[PDB]
Amino acid sequence: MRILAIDTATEACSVALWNNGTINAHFELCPREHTQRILPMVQEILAASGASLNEIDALAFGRGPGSFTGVRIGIGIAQGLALGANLPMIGVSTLATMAQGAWRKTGATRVLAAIDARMGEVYWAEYQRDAQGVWQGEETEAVLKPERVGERLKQLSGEWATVGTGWSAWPDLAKECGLTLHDGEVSLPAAEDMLPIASQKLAAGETVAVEHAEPVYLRNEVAWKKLPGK
Amino acid sequence: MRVLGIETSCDETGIAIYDDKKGLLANQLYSQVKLHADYGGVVPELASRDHVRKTVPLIQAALKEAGLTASDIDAVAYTAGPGLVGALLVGATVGRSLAFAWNVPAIPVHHMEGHLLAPMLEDNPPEFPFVALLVSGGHTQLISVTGIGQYELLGESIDDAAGEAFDKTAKLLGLDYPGGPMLSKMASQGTAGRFVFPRPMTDRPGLDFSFSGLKTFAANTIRSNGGDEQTRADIARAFEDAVVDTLMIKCKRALESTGFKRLVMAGGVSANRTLRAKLAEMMQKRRGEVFYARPEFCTDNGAMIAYAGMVRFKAGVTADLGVTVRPRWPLAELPAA
Numbered sequence A: 001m002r003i004l005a006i007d008t009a010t011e012a013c014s015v016a017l018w019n020n021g022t023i024n025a026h027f028e029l030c031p032r033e034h035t036q037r038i039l040p041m042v043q044e045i046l047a048a049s050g051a052s053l054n055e056i057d058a059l060a061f062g063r064g065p066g067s068f069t070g071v072r073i074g075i076g077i078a079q080g081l082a083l084g085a086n087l088p089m090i091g092v093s094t095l096a097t098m099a100q101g102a103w104r105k106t107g108a109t110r111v112l113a114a115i116d117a118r119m120g121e122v123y124w125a126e127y128q129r130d131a132q133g134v135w136q137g138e139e140t141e142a143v144l145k146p147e148r149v150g151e152r153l154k155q156l157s158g159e160w161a162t163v164g165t166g167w168s169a170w171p172d173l174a175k176e177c178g179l180t181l182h183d184g185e186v187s188l189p190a191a192e193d194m195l196p197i198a199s200q201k202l203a204a205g206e207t208v209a210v211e212h213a214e215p216v217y218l219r220n221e222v223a224w225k226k227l228p229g230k
Numbered sequence B: 001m002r003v004l005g006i007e008t009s010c011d012e013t014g015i016a017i018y019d020d021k022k023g024l025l026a027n028q029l030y031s032q033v034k035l036h037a038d039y040g041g042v043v044p045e046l047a048s049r050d051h052v053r054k055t056v057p058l059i060q061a062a063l064k065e066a067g068l069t070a071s072d073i074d075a076v077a078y079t080a081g082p083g084l085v086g087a088l089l090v091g092a093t094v095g096r097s098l099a100f101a102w103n104v105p106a107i108p109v110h111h112m113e114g115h116l117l118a119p120m121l122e123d124n125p126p127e128f129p130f131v132a133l134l135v136s137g138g139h140t141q142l143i144s145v146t147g148i149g150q151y152e153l154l155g156e157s158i159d160d161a162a163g164e165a166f167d168k169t170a171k172l173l174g175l176d177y178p179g180g181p182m183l184s185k186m187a188s189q190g191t192a193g194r195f196v197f198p199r200p201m202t203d204r205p206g207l208d209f210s211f212s213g214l215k216t217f218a219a220n221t222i223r224s225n226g227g228d229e230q231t232r233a234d235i236a237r238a239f240e241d242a243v244v245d246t247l248m249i250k251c252k253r254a255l256e257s258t259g260f261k262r263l264v265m266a267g268g269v270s271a272n273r274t275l276r277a278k279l280a281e282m283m284q285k286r287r288g289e290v291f292y293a294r295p296e297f298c299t300d301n302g303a304m305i306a307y308a309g310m311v312r313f314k315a316g317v318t319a320d321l322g323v324t325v326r327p328r329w330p331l332a333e334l335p336a337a
């Protein structure tokens, strides 16, 4: 039940460790500095709780969506660690992670997660916590134009908490939607909030060998046109 | 000892294991050329994405190939630059974290030093000093090499590198990107001397290169002649012969300037059949020696990184816990060994 979690998918860099009945965590804003901070942070959290990497039962990583570069830094570091220590990996959604954060901070059980995807779009999800603490709604994850999000909100009901930089970019996203929106108090994912999700997946056998780890980019359109005739 | 080398600088994922006693124990390579061909050039985001898909599986395959386990590896070397930042970051993050997990040193490697040392993988490797001609997709440089990390830049292209020149003319000939090697195959069937391209920068003194003018000359020749296969092969041959003659003249002048008796050629263009033959012939006539890598180690590969990583580790070069990539990194700035 020893789980190490790492994340670099957004402007934040964070690591957290569940070990011997305690949770240790570190979170900082690291714009442009992820590659300089992440391994020192992993080394630090491991050393602090007197844990060796090969004593870890599972390595959780922020799978995306987020910055393409950041998502890849996260999976790349996680893969090296997991390959090196033969650890199973658990990919955790950045969107679900922030939902868990809203619950931790505000008790929110229904969360509208939006990440600024750039190019006038957001990464979007609707997450709702069940009685067992499991966030339902993974199938809703998508990259969407704000107009499409607005249409979607008119199909939802009741009270929701908002999390993510997508709301920072587009705070008017839910204008005339008829929902009751609360601030979920989370703009960026923290590895600390990956841990309960990871622990659920571990118990369910939903881990993967290092060679099976995959990022979730959501935006998969290439941004360059093929040559004429292709 | 044994070093695991990881190369992800552009559009090839290369992994190798080099043992300083037994030689190369493994070499794995995936080339992304089919992924980028439809776009006419390397798409950085697609390249980065595919390195994620290939890096771990090819490291696993390398260990299996060599019949080794994790504990048999003494250091992990990875290309830190120059190259595409997104692509470099994949190999570098996997490499550095793997080294951390295995508790072995991590060795950041300069991609061009990797190219330069590739001929060391063959029997009868060059002794210092030598003139090195580095001719690849994006580089074309003459270097005075007096030892490891003792690289003095003698000259370089002021525009297109030789490799990209091959690829641009190949594109004009209707070949798939990157068309350099296919242009050379066409050229093999061409009639010597039917067309004659210029040899830029050879009338003036100095050791610098220029190739951009050959794209223009090719384009104008193609449009002013017939489109039959033979004529096209004749154009390809005239292009190739002009590039090779230019490189040979510049290498000769570099050998004159330094007084050296050894010429080392590396980078993808050093796989060219005509270049290999002409430089060999030149060195024979000079009573000197030429050195090159096997054709598959001329272009991007992991073997040269495992080798250069071993050299660098032995010279005292290791990484702290930061993962640092340097997309632009001049070869002349590396520390001496």
Ligand SMILES: Nc1ncnc2c1ncn2[C@@H]1O[C@H](COP(=O)(O)OP(=O)(O)OP(O)(O)=S)[C@@H](O)[C@H]1O
Residues within 6 Å of the ligand: B009, B010, B082, B083, B111, B112, B115, B135, B136, B137, B138, B139, B162, B163, B164, B166, B167, B178, B179, B180, B181, B184, B267, B268, B269, B270, B271, B272, B273, B298, B299, B300
């Ligand atoms: N037989 C050949 N004849 C002419 N050019 C060739 C041949 N084989 C490969 N090339 C060219 O070599 C170039 C690729 O060499 P590489 O060393 O793999 O390039 P690269 O690493 O992407 O370039 P860099 O980053 O500047 S070292 C391409 O431009 C190819 O067209």
Ligand SMILES: [Cl-]
Residues within 6 Å of the ligand: A223, B043, B044, B045, B046
């Ligand atoms: Cl791109």
Ligand SMILES: [Mg+2]
Residues within 6 Å of the ligand: B010, B011, B012, B300
């Ligand atoms: Mg390539």
Ligand SMILES: [Mg+2]
Residues within 6 Å of the ligand: B157, B158, B159
């Ligand atoms: Mg210049």
Ligand SMILES: [Zn+2]
Residues within 6 Å of the ligand: B111, B115, B136, B267, B268, B299, B300
């Ligand atoms: Zn190269």
